[PDB]
Design a binder for this molecule. Structure first.
Ligand SMILES: Nc1nc2c(ncn2[C@@H]2O[C@H](CO)[C@@H](OP(=O)(O)O)[C@H]2O)c(=O)[nH]1
Ligand SMILES: [Ca+2]
Length: 104
């Protein structure tokens, strides 16, 4: 069973932890990857009720199992905060335009 389901993409807690770790490291070092500069601030315009405090940062999680290193980020993201706490897993899949919905 999937711990997080984003559309047809299936993720386990291990997938999420691995992606989060890579993203948080880049954030700590003040570096970015990709044309859209990840990780970067996630403003939460959607208004999700996260259990952890802001600021939030978004980092792509890939269905391939690889850690994001550039190119297309796909539709899925892991959102973490300043204390490397997981806020949640979100996706563009099933959402209008460039909005997000939570992965179930
Ligand atoms: N939908 C949405 N996009 C946000 C939010 N905060 C920042 N963004 C950015 O606005 C764009 C929405 O797809 C993305 O930028 P990017 O295209 O540079 O990756 C996304 O990172 C937010 O809370 N909601
Ligand atoms: Ca996996």
């Amino acid at each position: 069973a999937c711990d997080y389901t984003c559309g047809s993409n299936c993720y386990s807690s291990s997938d999420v932890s691995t992606a989060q770790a890579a993203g948080y490291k880049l954030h700590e070092d003040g570096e970015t990857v990709g044309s859209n500069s990840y990780p970067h601030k996630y403003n939460n315009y959607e208004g999700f009720d996260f259990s952890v405090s802001s600021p939030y940062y978004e980092w792509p999680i890939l269905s391939s199992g690889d850690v994001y290193s550039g190119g297309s980020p796909g539709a899925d993201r892991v959102v973490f905060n300043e204390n490397n706490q997981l806020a949640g897993v979100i996706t563009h899949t099933g959402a209008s335009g460039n909005n997000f919905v939570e992965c179930t």
